[PDB]
Assembly symmetry: C3
Homo-oligomer: 163 residues x 3
Amino acid sequence: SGLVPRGSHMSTTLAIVRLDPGLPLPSRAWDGDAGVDLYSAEDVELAPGRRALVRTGVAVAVPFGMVGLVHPRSGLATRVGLSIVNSPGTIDAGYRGEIKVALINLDPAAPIVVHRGDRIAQLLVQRVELVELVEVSSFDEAGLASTSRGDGGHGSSGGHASL
Amino acid sequence: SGLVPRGSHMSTTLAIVRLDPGLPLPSRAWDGDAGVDLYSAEDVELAPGRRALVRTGVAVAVPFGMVGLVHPRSGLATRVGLSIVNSPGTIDAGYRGEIKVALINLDPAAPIVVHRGDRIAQLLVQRVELVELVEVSSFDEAGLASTSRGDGGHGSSGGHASL
Amino acid sequence: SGLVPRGSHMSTTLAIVRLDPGLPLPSRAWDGDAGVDLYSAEDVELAPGRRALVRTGVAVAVPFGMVGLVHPRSGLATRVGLSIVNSPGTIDAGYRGEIKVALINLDPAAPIVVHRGDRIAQLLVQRVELVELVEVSSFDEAGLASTSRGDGGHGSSGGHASL
Ligand SMILES: O=c1ccn([C@H]2C[C@H](O)[C@@H](COP(=O)(O)NP(=O)(O)OP(=O)(O)O)O2)c(=O)[nH]1
Ligand SMILES: O=c1ccn([C@H]2C[C@H](O)[C@@H](COP(=O)(O)NP(=O)(O)OP(=O)(O)O)O2)c(=O)[nH]1
Ligand SMILES: O=c1ccn([C@H]2C[C@H](O)[C@@H](COP(=O)(O)NP(=O)(O)OP(=O)(O)O)O2)c(=O)[nH]1
Ligand SMILES: [Mg+2]
Ligand SMILES: [Mg+2]
Ligand SMILES: [Mg+2]
């Protein structure tokens, strides 16, 4: 266990505080999984269309040059219509507060009951480009070549009757 | 074609099985596009507020150290209110099942009809940090410096009358 | 200021055009923040359940090999139920049009008023794998080893009463 394998030499460490020590540390369900599952610290009942800001019982220190991303779980999304209002939740490198999850019930009729200790979201960590904006008067002025896509967006490639 | 250009030497391959061989391979609409468009294998009609778990007809092997991400298309989102309940859908490196898309109709009044062969989502592949949690009693105890953001979140920087 | 610190040597530049020069350049709220906040160029009022495609007053040139990602802000999400229909919005490297934000009001009862100059979303820039699909008849045929997760998905790991 204690030996870092050569193919894991460069894997990143994430400092975590269990603000609620009664919950397990977040973990990957299976080897290779993109995220660690976040627990609810709280019981909450969401009627259709209602949202709540739910405590996870953890704080993390995302490294500088990275971002933490809070994603919904697919099973709850399909089974009961559970989603996250601000998905993907964007955890900044400087944030030292508790991670909170903005759960919302997108089912039209059935309430969702979350219990303390349920796994209600997943946390990924990725590098992010901390970009330096360069203001230009036009892309042409910036010596950028014309692109194939150009200003095409919002369904310009087709693929559905409404587009 | 067959020659990998020097600037593409390190581009990653993604093994894909067309579980439904009647659909085209997912493709980028234009050069440089972030994602390949996923097809619906199925006809489905979503009344306002309803969701479905839609088959794409594909399975992929996301490489270890990466994640597949299922995003909504912008044109359908604006034009008809189509969204994805668990967006961004998180495809794990170990997953060998069919990719499924949790479509939802967020329009209040008009149903959305999806036909087999429509492009209903897009799949991105990115590296992900497979983090090693390091539990600490406090960030200070971990020798982390105080940050500018501190525990500020959830609108702490302002920028709207409600914040 | 003008000196790039050694730890920022490789930070990426992003060309930006202020199509609406009356708005500030997007900025990070705090050092290390993952995204730059996008402004609304427009006044818009969203009744419950309504969406709009809102102009930000900017165009960017995301570098080839990268993607721009439009995420909701957490404070507005919780406080007033503001979300983005296609979140995370996927800005392609070839796109040279105006960035637009598909705001939606997920509150059941209270309208959301956005004013020109409000910060209504955040833009991240990340690398993306421009994948080369390799079609195979089965993962076994491709010499891929069996995985722990296998075809498990959509709540297969449990963690809620509904799963
Ligand atoms: O939030 C967004 C998302 C996309 N866009 C623009 C830039 C992007 O490159 C372009 C296409 O985005 P999508 O591929 O996500 N939407 P869709 O597939 O419907 O459009 P197209 O057919 O043009 O690819 O639309 C925005 O302005 N805001
Ligand atoms: O899902 C989330 C998203 C954010 N947060 C916290 C951590 C993040 O660094 C902080 C700010 O997130 P956003 O920038 O996405 N929201 P907003 O811009 O409204 O807040 P602020 O004004 O503080 O930047 O809120 C969560 O706890 N959960
Ligand atoms: O949009 C998606 C998201 C996930 N999936 C599949 C692949 C992924 O590896 C698997 C699990 O995804 P999540 O971890 O996001 N959902 P959940 O935690 O509910 O499932 P599990 O308990 O299996 O991890 O479900 C899809 O087919 N489409
Ligand atoms: Mg999972
Ligand atoms: Mg597209
Ligand atoms: Mg912010």
